[PDB]
Amino acid sequence: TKLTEEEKNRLNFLKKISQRYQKFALPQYLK
């Protein structure tokens, strides 16, 4: 597929970059 794959990738890319992107702001917690 073209949607499932991409959507499935975002979950990996986000979690992959999250490792380094946790100080810039971290929108995770409430805002």
Side-chain angles (χ1 to χ4, degrees):
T1 340
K2 200 81 234 281
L3 294 121
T4 332
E5 281 201 84
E6 278 245 292
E7 287 275 66
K8 181 237 159 192
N9 304 329
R10 194 235 293 281
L11 322 186
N12 284 230
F13 168 75
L14 212 310
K15 300 267 269 147
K16 175 140 179 226
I17 68 182
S18 139
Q19 311 308 339
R20 68 169 232 180
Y21 236 49
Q22 248 213 244
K23 75 192 262 247
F24 73 111
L26 190 138
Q28 308 182 52
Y29 81 132
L30 251 296
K31 52 118 98 77

PDB file of all heavy atoms in Angstrom:
ATOM      1  N   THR A   1       0.824  -1.202   0.000  1.00  0.00           N
ATOM      2  CA  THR A   1       0.000   0.000   0.000  1.00  0.00           C
ATOM      3  C   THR A   1       0.862   1.257   0.000  1.00  0.00           C
ATOM      4  O   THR A   1       2.085   1.184   0.115  1.00  0.00           O
ATOM      5  CB  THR A   1      -0.940   0.036   1.220  1.00  0.00           C
ATOM      6  OG1 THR A   1      -1.093  -1.282   1.759  1.00  0.00           O
ATOM      7  CG2 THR A   1      -2.302   0.593   0.836  1.00  0.00           C
ATOM      8  N   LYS A   2       0.215   2.411  -0.129  1.00  0.00           N
ATOM      9  CA  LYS A   2       0.922   3.687  -0.143  1.00  0.00           C
ATOM     10  C   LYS A   2       0.587   4.507   1.099  1.00  0.00           C
ATOM     11  O   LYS A   2       1.347   5.393   1.493  1.00  0.00           O
ATOM     12  CB  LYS A   2       0.563   4.479  -1.402  1.00  0.00           C
ATOM     13  CG  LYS A   2       1.570   5.562  -1.747  1.00  0.00           C
ATOM     14  CD  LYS A   2       2.780   4.990  -2.467  1.00  0.00           C
ATOM     15  CE  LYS A   2       4.078   5.387  -1.780  1.00  0.00           C
ATOM     16  NZ  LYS A   2       4.480   6.781  -2.117  1.00  0.00           N
ATOM     17  N   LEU A   3      -0.553   4.206   1.712  1.00  0.00           N
ATOM     18  CA  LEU A   3      -0.986   4.915   2.911  1.00  0.00           C
ATOM     19  C   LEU A   3      -0.518   4.193   4.169  1.00  0.00           C
ATOM     20  O   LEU A   3       0.122   4.787   5.038  1.00  0.00           O
ATOM     21  CB  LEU A   3      -2.510   5.050   2.923  1.00  0.00           C
ATOM     22  CG  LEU A   3      -3.115   5.932   1.830  1.00  0.00           C
ATOM     23  CD1 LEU A   3      -4.088   5.133   0.977  1.00  0.00           C
ATOM     24  CD2 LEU A   3      -3.806   7.141   2.441  1.00  0.00           C
ATOM     25  N   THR A   4      -0.839   2.906   4.261  1.00  0.00           N
ATOM     26  CA  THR A   4      -0.450   2.102   5.413  1.00  0.00           C
ATOM     27  C   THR A   4       1.044   2.218   5.685  1.00  0.00           C
ATOM     28  O   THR A   4       1.461   2.492   6.810  1.00  0.00           O
ATOM     29  CB  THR A   4      -0.811   0.618   5.210  1.00  0.00           C
ATOM     30  OG1 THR A   4      -1.936   0.504   4.333  1.00  0.00           O
ATOM     31  CG2 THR A   4      -1.128  -0.049   6.540  1.00  0.00           C
ATOM     32  N   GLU A   5       1.849   2.007   4.648  1.00  0.00           N
ATOM     33  CA  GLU A   5       3.299   2.087   4.777  1.00  0.00           C
ATOM     34  C   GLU A   5       3.718   3.428   5.374  1.00  0.00           C
ATOM     35  O   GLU A   5       4.350   3.478   6.427  1.00  0.00           O
ATOM     36  CB  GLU A   5       3.966   1.893   3.414  1.00  0.00           C
ATOM     37  CG  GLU A   5       4.039   0.440   2.974  1.00  0.00           C
ATOM     38  CD  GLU A   5       5.100   0.203   1.916  1.00  0.00           C
ATOM     39  OE1 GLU A   5       6.281   0.032   2.288  1.00  0.00           O
ATOM     40  OE2 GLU A   5       4.750   0.191   0.717  1.00  0.00           O
ATOM     41  N   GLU A   6       3.362   4.510   4.690  1.00  0.00           N
ATOM     42  CA  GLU A   6       3.702   5.852   5.152  1.00  0.00           C
ATOM     43  C   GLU A   6       3.268   6.055   6.600  1.00  0.00           C
ATOM     44  O   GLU A   6       4.080   6.395   7.460  1.00  0.00           O
ATOM     45  CB  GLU A   6       3.045   6.905   4.258  1.00  0.00           C
ATOM     46  CG  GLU A   6       3.819   7.188   2.981  1.00  0.00           C
ATOM     47  CD  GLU A   6       4.362   8.603   2.930  1.00  0.00           C
ATOM     48  OE1 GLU A   6       3.550   9.547   2.837  1.00  0.00           O
ATOM     49  OE2 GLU A   6       5.599   8.765   2.982  1.00  0.00           O
ATOM     50  N   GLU A   7       1.982   5.844   6.862  1.00  0.00           N
ATOM     51  CA  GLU A   7       1.439   6.005   8.206  1.00  0.00           C
ATOM     52  C   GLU A   7       2.226   5.172   9.213  1.00  0.00           C
ATOM     53  O   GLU A   7       2.445   5.594  10.349  1.00  0.00           O
ATOM     54  CB  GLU A   7      -0.037   5.602   8.235  1.00  0.00           C
ATOM     55  CG  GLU A   7      -0.955   6.603   7.554  1.00  0.00           C
ATOM     56  CD  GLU A   7      -1.372   7.733   8.475  1.00  0.00           C
ATOM     57  OE1 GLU A   7      -0.496   8.532   8.867  1.00  0.00           O
ATOM     58  OE2 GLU A   7      -2.573   7.817   8.805  1.00  0.00           O
ATOM     59  N   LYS A   8       2.648   3.985   8.789  1.00  0.00           N
ATOM     60  CA  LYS A   8       3.410   3.092   9.653  1.00  0.00           C
ATOM     61  C   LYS A   8       4.834   3.602   9.842  1.00  0.00           C
ATOM     62  O   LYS A   8       5.472   3.330  10.858  1.00  0.00           O
ATOM     63  CB  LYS A   8       3.438   1.679   9.062  1.00  0.00           C
ATOM     64  CG  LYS A   8       4.203   0.680   9.912  1.00  0.00           C
ATOM     65  CD  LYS A   8       5.325   0.023   9.126  1.00  0.00           C
ATOM     66  CE  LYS A   8       6.386  -0.558  10.047  1.00  0.00           C
ATOM     67  NZ  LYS A   8       7.617  -0.944   9.303  1.00  0.00           N
ATOM     68  N   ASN A   9       5.328   4.346   8.857  1.00  0.00           N
ATOM     69  CA  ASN A   9       6.677   4.895   8.916  1.00  0.00           C
ATOM     70  C   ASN A   9       6.744   6.071   9.885  1.00  0.00           C
ATOM     71  O   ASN A   9       7.692   6.197  10.660  1.00  0.00           O
ATOM     72  CB  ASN A   9       7.131   5.341   7.524  1.00  0.00           C
ATOM     73  CG  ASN A   9       7.047   4.221   6.503  1.00  0.00           C
ATOM     74  OD1 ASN A   9       7.208   3.048   6.837  1.00  0.00           O
ATOM     75  ND2 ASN A   9       6.794   4.582   5.250  1.00  0.00           N
ATOM     76  N   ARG A  10       5.730   6.929   9.836  1.00  0.00           N
ATOM     77  CA  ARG A  10       5.673   8.095  10.709  1.00  0.00           C
ATOM     78  C   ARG A  10       5.871   7.693  12.167  1.00  0.00           C
ATOM     79  O   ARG A  10       6.525   8.401  12.934  1.00  0.00           O
ATOM     80  CB  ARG A  10       4.334   8.817  10.545  1.00  0.00           C
ATOM     81  CG  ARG A  10       4.311  10.207  11.158  1.00  0.00           C
ATOM     82  CD  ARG A  10       3.170  10.360  12.150  1.00  0.00           C
ATOM     83  NE  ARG A  10       1.865  10.304  11.497  1.00  0.00           N
ATOM     84  CZ  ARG A  10       1.327  11.327  10.844  1.00  0.00           C
ATOM     85  NH1 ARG A  10       1.976  12.480  10.757  1.00  0.00           N
ATOM     86  NH2 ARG A  10       0.134  11.199  10.274  1.00  0.00           N
ATOM     87  N   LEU A  11       5.301   6.554  12.544  1.00  0.00           N
ATOM     88  CA  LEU A  11       5.413   6.057  13.910  1.00  0.00           C
ATOM     89  C   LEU A  11       6.859   5.703  14.244  1.00  0.00           C
ATOM     90  O   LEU A  11       7.289   5.825  15.390  1.00  0.00           O
ATOM     91  CB  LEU A  11       4.519   4.832  14.104  1.00  0.00           C
ATOM     92  CG  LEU A  11       3.166   4.869  13.392  1.00  0.00           C
ATOM     93  CD1 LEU A  11       2.321   3.667  13.788  1.00  0.00           C
ATOM     94  CD2 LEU A  11       2.433   6.165  13.706  1.00  0.00           C
ATOM     95  N   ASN A  12       7.604   5.269  13.233  1.00  0.00           N
ATOM     96  CA  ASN A  12       9.002   4.898  13.419  1.00  0.00           C
ATOM     97  C   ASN A  12       9.902   6.129  13.364  1.00  0.00           C
ATOM     98  O   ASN A  12      10.831   6.269  14.161  1.00  0.00           O
ATOM     99  CB  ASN A  12       9.431   3.891  12.349  1.00  0.00           C
ATOM    100  CG  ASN A  12       8.905   2.496  12.625  1.00  0.00           C
ATOM    101  OD1 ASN A  12       9.658   1.521  12.600  1.00  0.00           O
ATOM    102  ND2 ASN A  12       7.609   2.395  12.890  1.00  0.00           N
ATOM    103  N   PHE A  13       9.621   7.021  12.419  1.00  0.00           N
ATOM    104  CA  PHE A  13      10.405   8.240  12.260  1.00  0.00           C
ATOM    105  C   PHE A  13      10.266   9.138  13.485  1.00  0.00           C
ATOM    106  O   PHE A  13      11.251   9.693  13.977  1.00  0.00           O
ATOM    107  CB  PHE A  13       9.961   8.996  11.006  1.00  0.00           C
ATOM    108  CG  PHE A  13      10.510  10.392  10.922  1.00  0.00           C
ATOM    109  CD1 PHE A  13      11.837  10.611  10.593  1.00  0.00           C
ATOM    110  CD2 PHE A  13       9.696  11.485  11.173  1.00  0.00           C
ATOM    111  CE1 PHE A  13      12.344  11.894  10.516  1.00  0.00           C
ATOM    112  CE2 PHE A  13      10.198  12.771  11.098  1.00  0.00           C
ATOM    113  CZ  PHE A  13      11.523  12.976  10.768  1.00  0.00           C
ATOM    114  N   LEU A  14       9.038   9.279  13.973  1.00  0.00           N
ATOM    115  CA  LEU A  14       8.770  10.111  15.140  1.00  0.00           C
ATOM    116  C   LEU A  14       9.484   9.566  16.373  1.00  0.00           C
ATOM    117  O   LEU A  14      10.139  10.309  17.104  1.00  0.00           O
ATOM    118  CB  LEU A  14       7.265  10.188  15.400  1.00  0.00           C
ATOM    119  CG  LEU A  14       6.755  11.497  16.006  1.00  0.00           C
ATOM    120  CD1 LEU A  14       7.577  11.877  17.227  1.00  0.00           C
ATOM    121  CD2 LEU A  14       6.788  12.612  14.970  1.00  0.00           C
ATOM    122  N   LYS A  15       9.353   8.263  16.598  1.00  0.00           N
ATOM    123  CA  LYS A  15       9.988   7.616  17.740  1.00  0.00           C
ATOM    124  C   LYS A  15      11.501   7.559  17.561  1.00  0.00           C
ATOM    125  O   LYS A  15      12.251   7.526  18.537  1.00  0.00           O
ATOM    126  CB  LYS A  15       9.431   6.202  17.924  1.00  0.00           C
ATOM    127  CG  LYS A  15       7.933   6.164  18.169  1.00  0.00           C
ATOM    128  CD  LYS A  15       7.609   6.168  19.652  1.00  0.00           C
ATOM    129  CE  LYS A  15       7.499   4.754  20.203  1.00  0.00           C
ATOM    130  NZ  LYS A  15       7.971   4.669  21.613  1.00  0.00           N
ATOM    131  N   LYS A  16      11.945   7.549  16.309  1.00  0.00           N
ATOM    132  CA  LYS A  16      13.369   7.499  16.001  1.00  0.00           C
ATOM    133  C   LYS A  16      14.027   8.853  16.250  1.00  0.00           C
ATOM    134  O   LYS A  16      15.159   8.924  16.732  1.00  0.00           O
ATOM    135  CB  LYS A  16      13.584   7.075  14.546  1.00  0.00           C
ATOM    136  CG  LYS A  16      15.038   7.113  14.110  1.00  0.00           C
ATOM    137  CD  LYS A  16      15.390   5.919  13.239  1.00  0.00           C
ATOM    138  CE  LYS A  16      16.839   5.971  12.780  1.00  0.00           C
ATOM    139  NZ  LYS A  16      16.973   5.664  11.329  1.00  0.00           N
ATOM    140  N   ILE A  17      13.313   9.922  15.920  1.00  0.00           N
ATOM    141  CA  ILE A  17      13.827  11.273  16.109  1.00  0.00           C
ATOM    142  C   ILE A  17      13.548  11.774  17.523  1.00  0.00           C
ATOM    143  O   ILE A  17      14.267  12.625  18.044  1.00  0.00           O
ATOM    144  CB  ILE A  17      13.212  12.257  15.097  1.00  0.00           C
ATOM    145  CG1 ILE A  17      11.723  12.460  15.390  1.00  0.00           C
ATOM    146  CG2 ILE A  17      13.414  11.752  13.676  1.00  0.00           C
ATOM    147  CD1 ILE A  17      11.032  13.373  14.401  1.00  0.00           C
ATOM    148  N   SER A  18      12.499  11.237  18.138  1.00  0.00           N
ATOM    149  CA  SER A  18      12.123  11.631  19.490  1.00  0.00           C
ATOM    150  C   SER A  18      13.286  11.432  20.457  1.00  0.00           C
ATOM    151  O   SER A  18      13.439  12.180  21.422  1.00  0.00           O
ATOM    152  CB  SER A  18      10.911  10.824  19.961  1.00  0.00           C
ATOM    153  OG  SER A  18      11.050  10.437  21.317  1.00  0.00           O
ATOM    154  N   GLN A  19      14.102  10.418  20.191  1.00  0.00           N
ATOM    155  CA  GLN A  19      15.252  10.118  21.037  1.00  0.00           C
ATOM    156  C   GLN A  19      16.155  11.339  21.180  1.00  0.00           C
ATOM    157  O   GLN A  19      16.682  11.611  22.258  1.00  0.00           O
ATOM    158  CB  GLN A  19      16.046   8.946  20.460  1.00  0.00           C
ATOM    159  CG  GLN A  19      15.184   7.749  20.093  1.00  0.00           C
ATOM    160  CD  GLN A  19      14.293   7.299  21.234  1.00  0.00           C
ATOM    161  OE1 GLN A  19      14.557   7.601  22.399  1.00  0.00           O
ATOM    162  NE2 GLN A  19      13.230   6.574  20.906  1.00  0.00           N
ATOM    163  N   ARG A  20      16.327  12.072  20.084  1.00  0.00           N
ATOM    164  CA  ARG A  20      17.169  13.263  20.087  1.00  0.00           C
ATOM    165  C   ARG A  20      16.332  14.518  20.315  1.00  0.00           C
ATOM    166  O   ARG A  20      16.810  15.500  20.884  1.00  0.00           O
ATOM    167  CB  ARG A  20      17.930  13.378  18.766  1.00  0.00           C
ATOM    168  CG  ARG A  20      17.039  13.682  17.572  1.00  0.00           C
ATOM    169  CD  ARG A  20      17.858  14.040  16.342  1.00  0.00           C
ATOM    170  NE  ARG A  20      17.426  15.302  15.746  1.00  0.00           N
ATOM    171  CZ  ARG A  20      17.986  15.832  14.664  1.00  0.00           C
ATOM    172  NH1 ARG A  20      18.991  15.213  14.062  1.00  0.00           N
ATOM    173  NH2 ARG A  20      17.537  16.984  14.181  1.00  0.00           N
ATOM    174  N   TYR A  21      15.082  14.480  19.867  1.00  0.00           N
ATOM    175  CA  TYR A  21      14.181  15.615  20.019  1.00  0.00           C
ATOM    176  C   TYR A  21      13.349  15.483  21.291  1.00  0.00           C
ATOM    177  O   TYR A  21      12.173  15.123  21.242  1.00  0.00           O
ATOM    178  CB  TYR A  21      13.258  15.727  18.803  1.00  0.00           C
ATOM    179  CG  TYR A  21      13.317  17.075  18.121  1.00  0.00           C
ATOM    180  CD1 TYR A  21      14.536  17.657  17.791  1.00  0.00           C
ATOM    181  CD2 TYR A  21      12.155  17.769  17.808  1.00  0.00           C
ATOM    182  CE1 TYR A  21      14.594  18.888  17.169  1.00  0.00           C
ATOM    183  CE2 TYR A  21      12.204  19.000  17.183  1.00  0.00           C
ATOM    184  CZ  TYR A  21      13.426  19.556  16.867  1.00  0.00           C
ATOM    185  OH  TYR A  21      13.479  20.783  16.247  1.00  0.00           O
ATOM    186  N   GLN A  22      13.969  15.779  22.429  1.00  0.00           N
ATOM    187  CA  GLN A  22      13.287  15.693  23.715  1.00  0.00           C
ATOM    188  C   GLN A  22      13.623  16.896  24.590  1.00  0.00           C
ATOM    189  O   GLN A  22      13.272  16.938  25.769  1.00  0.00           O
ATOM    190  CB  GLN A  22      13.672  14.400  24.435  1.00  0.00           C
ATOM    191  CG  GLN A  22      12.526  13.409  24.561  1.00  0.00           C
ATOM    192  CD  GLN A  22      12.592  12.600  25.841  1.00  0.00           C
ATOM    193  OE1 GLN A  22      12.745  11.378  25.810  1.00  0.00           O
ATOM    194  NE2 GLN A  22      12.476  13.278  26.977  1.00  0.00           N
ATOM    195  N   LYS A  23      14.307  17.874  24.005  1.00  0.00           N
ATOM    196  CA  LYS A  23      14.691  19.079  24.731  1.00  0.00           C
ATOM    197  C   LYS A  23      14.186  20.329  24.015  1.00  0.00           C
ATOM    198  O   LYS A  23      13.934  21.357  24.644  1.00  0.00           O
ATOM    199  CB  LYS A  23      16.212  19.145  24.883  1.00  0.00           C
ATOM    200  CG  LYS A  23      16.935  19.527  23.603  1.00  0.00           C
ATOM    201  CD  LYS A  23      18.434  19.308  23.722  1.00  0.00           C
ATOM    202  CE  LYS A  23      19.161  20.599  24.066  1.00  0.00           C
ATOM    203  NZ  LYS A  23      20.040  21.053  22.952  1.00  0.00           N
ATOM    204  N   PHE A  24      14.040  20.232  22.698  1.00  0.00           N
ATOM    205  CA  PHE A  24      13.565  21.355  21.897  1.00  0.00           C
ATOM    206  C   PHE A  24      12.302  21.958  22.503  1.00  0.00           C
ATOM    207  O   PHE A  24      12.089  23.169  22.443  1.00  0.00           O
ATOM    208  CB  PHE A  24      13.290  20.904  20.462  1.00  0.00           C
ATOM    209  CG  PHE A  24      12.055  20.061  20.324  1.00  0.00           C
ATOM    210  CD1 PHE A  24      10.934  20.552  19.675  1.00  0.00           C
ATOM    211  CD2 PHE A  24      12.014  18.777  20.843  1.00  0.00           C
ATOM    212  CE1 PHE A  24       9.795  19.779  19.547  1.00  0.00           C
ATOM    213  CE2 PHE A  24      10.879  17.999  20.718  1.00  0.00           C
ATOM    214  CZ  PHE A  24       9.768  18.500  20.069  1.00  0.00           C
ATOM    215  N   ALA A  25      11.466  21.105  23.087  1.00  0.00           N
ATOM    216  CA  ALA A  25      10.224  21.555  23.705  1.00  0.00           C
ATOM    217  C   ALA A  25       9.443  20.379  24.283  1.00  0.00           C
ATOM    218  O   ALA A  25       8.899  20.464  25.385  1.00  0.00           O
ATOM    219  CB  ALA A  25       9.374  22.310  22.694  1.00  0.00           C
ATOM    220  N   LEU A  26       9.390  19.283  23.533  1.00  0.00           N
ATOM    221  CA  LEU A  26       8.675  18.091  23.971  1.00  0.00           C
ATOM    222  C   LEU A  26       7.189  18.385  24.159  1.00  0.00           C
ATOM    223  O   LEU A  26       6.709  18.593  25.274  1.00  0.00           O
ATOM    224  CB  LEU A  26       9.272  17.564  25.277  1.00  0.00           C
ATOM    225  CG  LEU A  26       8.783  16.188  25.732  1.00  0.00           C
ATOM    226  CD1 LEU A  26       9.943  15.355  26.253  1.00  0.00           C
ATOM    227  CD2 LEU A  26       7.705  16.330  26.797  1.00  0.00           C
ATOM    228  N   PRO A  27       6.443  18.400  23.045  1.00  0.00           N
ATOM    229  CA  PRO A  27       5.001  18.665  23.062  1.00  0.00           C
ATOM    230  C   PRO A  27       4.210  17.525  23.695  1.00  0.00           C
ATOM    231  O   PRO A  27       2.998  17.630  23.884  1.00  0.00           O
ATOM    232  CB  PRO A  27       4.648  18.802  21.579  1.00  0.00           C
ATOM    233  CG  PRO A  27       5.694  18.016  20.867  1.00  0.00           C
ATOM    234  CD  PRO A  27       6.948  18.160  21.683  1.00  0.00           C
ATOM    235  N   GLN A  28       4.903  16.438  24.019  1.00  0.00           N
ATOM    236  CA  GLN A  28       4.264  15.279  24.630  1.00  0.00           C
ATOM    237  C   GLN A  28       3.362  15.701  25.786  1.00  0.00           C
ATOM    238  O   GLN A  28       2.137  15.634  25.686  1.00  0.00           O
ATOM    239  CB  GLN A  28       5.319  14.290  25.125  1.00  0.00           C
ATOM    240  CG  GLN A  28       6.341  13.909  24.065  1.00  0.00           C
ATOM    241  CD  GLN A  28       7.346  12.890  24.564  1.00  0.00           C
ATOM    242  OE1 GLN A  28       6.976  11.844  25.098  1.00  0.00           O
ATOM    243  NE2 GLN A  28       8.628  13.190  24.392  1.00  0.00           N
ATOM    244  N   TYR A  29       3.977  16.134  26.880  1.00  0.00           N
ATOM    245  CA  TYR A  29       3.231  16.564  28.057  1.00  0.00           C
ATOM    246  C   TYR A  29       2.163  17.586  27.681  1.00  0.00           C
ATOM    247  O   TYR A  29       2.200  18.170  26.596  1.00  0.00           O
ATOM    248  CB  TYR A  29       4.179  17.160  29.099  1.00  0.00           C
ATOM    249  CG  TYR A  29       4.550  18.600  28.827  1.00  0.00           C
ATOM    250  CD1 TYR A  29       4.479  19.558  29.830  1.00  0.00           C
ATOM    251  CD2 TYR A  29       4.973  19.002  27.565  1.00  0.00           C
ATOM    252  CE1 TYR A  29       4.817  20.875  29.585  1.00  0.00           C
ATOM    253  CE2 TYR A  29       5.314  20.316  27.312  1.00  0.00           C
ATOM    254  CZ  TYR A  29       5.233  21.249  28.325  1.00  0.00           C
ATOM    255  OH  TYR A  29       5.572  22.560  28.078  1.00  0.00           O
ATOM    256  N   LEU A  30       1.212  17.799  28.584  1.00  0.00           N
ATOM    257  CA  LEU A  30       0.133  18.753  28.350  1.00  0.00           C
ATOM    258  C   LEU A  30       0.689  20.123  27.972  1.00  0.00           C
ATOM    259  O   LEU A  30       1.865  20.410  28.196  1.00  0.00           O
ATOM    260  CB  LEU A  30      -0.747  18.872  29.595  1.00  0.00           C
ATOM    261  CG  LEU A  30      -2.142  18.256  29.492  1.00  0.00           C
ATOM    262  CD1 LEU A  30      -2.971  18.982  28.443  1.00  0.00           C
ATOM    263  CD2 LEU A  30      -2.048  16.772  29.166  1.00  0.00           C
ATOM    264  N   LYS A  31      -0.165  20.964  27.402  1.00  0.00           N
ATOM    265  CA  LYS A  31       0.237  22.306  26.996  1.00  0.00           C
ATOM    266  C   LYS A  31      -0.745  23.350  27.515  1.00  0.00           C
ATOM    267  O   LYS A  31      -0.702  23.728  28.687  1.00  0.00           O
ATOM    268  CB  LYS A  31       0.331  22.393  25.471  1.00  0.00           C
ATOM    269  CG  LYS A  31      -0.917  21.904  24.755  1.00  0.00           C
ATOM    270  CD  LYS A  31      -1.560  23.010  23.937  1.00  0.00           C
ATOM    271  CE  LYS A  31      -1.164  22.922  22.471  1.00  0.00           C
ATOM    272  NZ  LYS A  31      -1.907  21.844  21.760  1.00  0.00           N
TER     273      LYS A  31
END
